[PDB]
Amino acid sequence: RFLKVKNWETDVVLTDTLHLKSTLETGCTEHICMGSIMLPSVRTKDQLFPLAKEFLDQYYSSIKRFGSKAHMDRLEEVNKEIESTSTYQLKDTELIYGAKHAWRNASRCVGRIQWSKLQVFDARDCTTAHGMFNYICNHVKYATNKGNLRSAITIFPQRTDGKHDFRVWNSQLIRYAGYKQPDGSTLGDPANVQFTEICIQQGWKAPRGRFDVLPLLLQANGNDPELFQIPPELVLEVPIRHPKFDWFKDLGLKWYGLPAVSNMLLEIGGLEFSACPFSGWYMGTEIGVRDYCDNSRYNILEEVAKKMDLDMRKTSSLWKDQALVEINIAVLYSFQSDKVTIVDHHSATESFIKHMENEYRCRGGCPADWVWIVPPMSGSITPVFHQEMLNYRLTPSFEYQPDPWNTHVWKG
Amino acid sequence: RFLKVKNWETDVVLTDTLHLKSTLETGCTEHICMGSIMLPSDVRTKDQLFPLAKEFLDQYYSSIKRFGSKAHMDRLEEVNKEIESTSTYQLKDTELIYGAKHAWRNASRCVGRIQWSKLQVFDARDCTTAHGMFNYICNHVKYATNKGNLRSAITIFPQRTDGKHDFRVWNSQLIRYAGYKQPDGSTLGDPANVQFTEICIQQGWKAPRGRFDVLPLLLQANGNDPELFQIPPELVLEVPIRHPKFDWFKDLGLKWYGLPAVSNMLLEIGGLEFSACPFSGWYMGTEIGVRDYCDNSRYNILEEVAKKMDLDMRKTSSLWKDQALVEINIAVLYSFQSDKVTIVDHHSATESFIKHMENEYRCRGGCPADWVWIVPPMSGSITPVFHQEMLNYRLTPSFEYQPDPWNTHVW
Ligand code: HEM
Ligand code: HEM
Ligand SMILES: Cc1cc(CCNCc2ccc3c(C)cc(N)nc3c2)ccc1C#N
Ligand SMILES: Cc1cc(CCNCc2ccc3c(C)cc(N)nc3c2)ccc1C#N
Ligand SMILES: C[C@H](O)[C@H](O)[C@H]1CNc2nc(N)[nH]c(=O)c2N1
Ligand SMILES: C[C@H](O)[C@H](O)[C@H]1CNc2nc(N)[nH]c(=O)c2N1
Ligand SMILES: [Zn+2]
Numbered sequence: 001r002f003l004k005v006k007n008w009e010t011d012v013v014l015t016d017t018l019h020l021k022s023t024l025e026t027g028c029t030e031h032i033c034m035g036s037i038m039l040p041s042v043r044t045k046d047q048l049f050p051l052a053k054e055f056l057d058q059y060y061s062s063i064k065r066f067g068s069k070a071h072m073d074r075l076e077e078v079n080k081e082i083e084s085t086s087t088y089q090l091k092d093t094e095l096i097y098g099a100k101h102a103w104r105n106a107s108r109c110v111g112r113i114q115w116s117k118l119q120v121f122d123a124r125d126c127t128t129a130h131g132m133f134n135y136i137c138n139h140v141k142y143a144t145n146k147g148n149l150r151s152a153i154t155i156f157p158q159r160t161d162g163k164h165d166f167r168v169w170n171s172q173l174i175r176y177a178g179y180k181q182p183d184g185s186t187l188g189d190p191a192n193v194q195f196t197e198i199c200i201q202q203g204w205k206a207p208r209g210r211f212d213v214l215p216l217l218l219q220a221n222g223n224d225p226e227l228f229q230i231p232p233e234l235v236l237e238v239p240i241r242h243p244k245f246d247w248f249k250d251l252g253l254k255w256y257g258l259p260a261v262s263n264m265l266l267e268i269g270g271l272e273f274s275a276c277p278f279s280g281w282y283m284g285t286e287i288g289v290r291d292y293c294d295n296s297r298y299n300i301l302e303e304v305a306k307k308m309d310l311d312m313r314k315t316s317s318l319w320k321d322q323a324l325v326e327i328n329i330a331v332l333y334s335f336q337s338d339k340v341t342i343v344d345h346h347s348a349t350e351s352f353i354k355h356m357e358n359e360y361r362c363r364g365g366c367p368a369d370w371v372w373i374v375p376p377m378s379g380s381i382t383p384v385f386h387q388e389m390l391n392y393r394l395t396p397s398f399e400y401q402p403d404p405w406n407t408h409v410w411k412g
Numbered sequence: 413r414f415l416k417v418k419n420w421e422t423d424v425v426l427t428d429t430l431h432l433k434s435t436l437e438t439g440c441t442e443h444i445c446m447g448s449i450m451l452p453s454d455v456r457t458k459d460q461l462f463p464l465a466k467e468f469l470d471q472y473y474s475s476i477k478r479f480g481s482k483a484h485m486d487r488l489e490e491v492n493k494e495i496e497s498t499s500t501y502q503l504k505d506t507e508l509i510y511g512a513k514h515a516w517r518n519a520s521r522c523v524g525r526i527q528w529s530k531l532q533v534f535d536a537r538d539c540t541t542a543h544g545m546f547n548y549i550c551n552h553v554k555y556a557t558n559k560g561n562l563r564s565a566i567t568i569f570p571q572r573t574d575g576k577h578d579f580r581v582w583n584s585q586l587i588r589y590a591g592y593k594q595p596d597g598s599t600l601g602d603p604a605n606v607q608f609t610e611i612c613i614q615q616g617w618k619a620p621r622g623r624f625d626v627l628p629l630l631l632q633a634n635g636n637d638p639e640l641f642q643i644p645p646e647l648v649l650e651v652p653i654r655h656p657k658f659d660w661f662k663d664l665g666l667k668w669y670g671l672p673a674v675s676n677m678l679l680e681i682g683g684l685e686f687s688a689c690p691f692s693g694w695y696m697g698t699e700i701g702v703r704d705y706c707d708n709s710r711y712n713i714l715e716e717v718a719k720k721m722d723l724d725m726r727k728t729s730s731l732w733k734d735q736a737l738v739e740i741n742i743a744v745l746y747s748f749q750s751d752k753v754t755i756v757d758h759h760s761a762t763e764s765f766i767k768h769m770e771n772e773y774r775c776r777g778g779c780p781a782d783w784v785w786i787v788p789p790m791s792g793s794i795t796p797v798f799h800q801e802m803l804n805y806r807l808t809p810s811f812e813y814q815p816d817p818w819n820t821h822v823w
Contacts, residue, residue, distance in 0.1 A: 035447030
């Protein structure tokens with residue numbers, strides 16, 4: 001079974017064979033497309049061997065050693081261990097390979113041209129929340145690299161009986177607090193109101209400002225989570241200024257430099273790593289379009305447009321569109337001026353097209369989620385808009401998991 | 413299998429029950445989503461056709477509160493006998509109108525479907541020649557344009573009978589600008605219409621030498637060779653493109669036509685196939701300003717506009733492209749609005765569509781919708797539809813694509 005995708009701007013045609021190796025499901029059927037559904041969706045060892053064998057077959061193929069004595073012994077080894085312990089342990093090399101390919105397989109990620117250059121931190125010997133805090137400080141320091149950002153992931157011990165999970169309760173390692181005011185307004189990031197309240201309940205002394213960096217809330221071995229303050233000197237931030245508009249600085253905006261997602265689940269050969277924070281660097285629109293201009297976030301369009309003196313009572317003046325562009329210019333300008341790594345959506349999407357084509361040629365495909373790959377502004381003037389993409393799920397992978405405060409059994 | 417869609421900007425959740433009636437396929441499977449493929453992939457035998465007819469008549473008679481009525485049963489009986497008789501059947505006027513409105517209601521890629529029930533249907537089933545097709549099309553155009561106060565319309569030519577005698581409009585839209593080869597190996601016109609614009613000449617057109625030249629109609633009646641007709645220029649409403657602030661904008665020489673009228677699709681109702689069924693509404697601003705003007709495969713005026721704004725074009729990070737794109741789209745809206753010609757901005761139209769969705773979920777139990785096509789090509793996430801989960805599925809009656817005539821026409 002072969003599959004063709006077309007670029008409608010360049011008429012480049014590529015052929016997908018990689019989708020044949022696709023195990024998991026999409027959520028779609030031949031009678032319905034769930035391509036715009038945000039999230040569509042305790043391991044017995046009946047299920048675990050095949051998943052382990054498949055991963056190991058992948059691994060030893062990638063290293064030129066399929067069918068080798070080393071390949072066969074490792075299979076036998078892992079089988080014995082699953083027989084004996086109902087789970088198994090990855091070698092370091094397998095772990096690094098798994099984590100890189102999870103990224104490579106991440107069909108929603110436009111930054112995947114960088115997948116081979118992931119720094120993998122093995123935190124599988126960690127046992128306490130304090131140890132978790134230490135590992136995460138080191139991740140942050142390393143990844144930030146004084147503004148010259150480096151991709152990294154830190155991998156905490158895998159799930160066992162599901163009653164001893166390691167979880168980072170933060171959705172991101174660095175994020176701003178949100179406070180719901182009595183009058184209904186929100187101070188700070190509305191996306192984080194719920195988590196902020198938990199932290200506050202857990203004993204966090206909230207500064208109650210508009211850009212308070214949240215404390216880490218860390219759960220080790222299924223114990224109750226504990227609060228830690230990331231040392232402020234480790235949190236790199238950028239004041240947002242505009243290159244031509246001088247009043248922009250007076251909006252009092254800033255953002256943090258390091259995007260580090262910490263609530264996803266890393267799956268490798270059937271093993272589940274429930275705490276595996278990973279980080280890269282920002283695409284400008286993440287901050288300028290979504291974080292700042294989503295109505296459910298900081299929502300600064302009107303104030304910006306107000307100070308641009310735009311005609312704001314006629315939507316067909318496109319005053320929203322006009323302000324959106326200036327804000328994104330300011331985000332890019334600020335990061336570059338402070339020499340903090342950032343990529344504009346034009347450069348990012350162009351790179352991904354080059355990546356995708358390369359992946360089709362050396363790998364036979366590259367699973368891609370159009371709905372997420374196309375930037376949140378300026379869609380059709382980026383080349384991904386005009387690119388047909390096949391979406392399918394490969395392992396190793398990053399998966400969503402439910403919020404820990406919903407499932408956690410509290411010890412007290 | 414009673415599905416939920418969530419809006420992540422408002423937490424509004426809708427329950428979809430309508431998808432269960434879906435007939436055709438999507439392109440997707442368990443193992444692969446083809447949601448972003450532009451085009452997922454001879455007449456019908458006689459009880460391929462009756463179940464098709466029955467399904468249609470059931471929903472038609474259900475729609476008028478007469479399901480299970482003897483008038484319903486009589487119509488099924490009548491169509492059933494007409495079917496076994498003639499290897500086909502003919503729609504009642506009422507059925508034809510219902511079918512056309514619902515083909516629009518069911519177009520999952522269309523953002524403007526809140527207007528679906530106010531469609532002017534022109535029955536052209538008595539047409540026999542390309543000259544008659546031309547007459548019907550001029551009347552469609554004059555009616556739809558309405559001196560700038562645009563009105564939705566569809567004109568329906570005779571149904572396919574078996575591929576023998578297909579009626580086809582060879583243009584992709586009733587009104588489009590010529591795109592020719594040229595010197596330099598450059599392109600003058602609309603590059604998108606290159607191939608078509610000299611098939612016109614390949615057939616006898618002689619072209620006015622410009623870029624914004626309205627193409628001639630190329631009409632095929634009863635499977636015959638297609639004929640050339642020029643739409644009377646006084647029927648073709650065009651809008652000069654100026655900017656409300658930048659007065660150099662006029663010098664680019666930009667204009668666009670008022671009437672978007674798609675003419676190469678196939679309308680399917682109760683198994684019957686209408687290969688010539690041009691339909692029209694009015695533009696959303698971004699279709700012209702973002703796609704028609706700024707696509708690299710189209711008029712691609714970005715560089716030109718940026719230069720005169722004297723923007724920093726040395727590298728992508730200045731977002732000069734983005735800045736110009738917005739100004740270009742402000743102008744289109746401005747020009748159309750000032751010439752009192754109908755147009756909707758992408759903010760208004762997407763807001764309309766959200767209201768439309770809530771209407772369809774409430775009164776109909778769902779609204780099929782293709783997120784990839786509904787989200788505007790600029791300013792995606794500041795329109796409400798970006799944050800709207802949508803389910804895509806195929807309902808009938810429908811508008812479908814069909815092969816380009818010049819490939820299939822036994823010449
Ligand atoms: C190095 C620069 C990187 C850039 C510019 C980048 C960019 C992006 C963007 C724009 C998204 C869309 C998500 C959103 O808009 O909220 C995304 C999603 C994603 N990225 Fe990347 N990324 C980078 C690195 C990484 C790394 C290092 C990993 C993992 C090790 C990764 C894994 C993912 C995953 C799993 C998603 C899907 C998130 C979800 O479905 O919720 N990315 N990326
Ligand atoms: C009245 C105002 C209308 C507006 C504002 C509107 C808007 C749009 C837009 C923006 C698209 C996206 C396609 C593209 O970007 O090329 C579209 C597609 C479509 N529209 Fe509507 N439209 C309108 C009227 C109509 C009418 C009257 C019909 C049929 C009677 C119709 C049927 C369709 C169909 C079938 C598509 C999908 C085309 C395809 O799949 O290639 N529309 N429309
Ligand atoms: C369910 C959900 C999911 C998400 C995902 C947002 N984060 C995705 C992501 C994940 C990793 C990234 C990385 C690693 C870098 C980067 N620049 N951006 C990244 C963005 C956002 C909101 C919601 C909600 N509600
Ligand atoms: C296969 C294809 C399809 C399309 C779709 C273009 N037509 C869509 C359409 C169809 C009808 C419309 C109508 C009726 C109004 C309006 N404002 N916009 C409309 C837009 C464009 C390019 C290709 C190609 N190649
Ligand atoms: C409803 C829809 O799936 C949702 O709004 C998606 C659309 N595409 C996206 N794309 C990116 N990169 N990030 C997002 O959060 C979303 N949200
Ligand atoms: C490959 C992709 O499907 C293609 O570029 C689509 C994307 N979305 C679109 N959306 C609209 N409204 N019109 C289009 O032509 C397209 N083109
Ligand atoms: Zn799908």
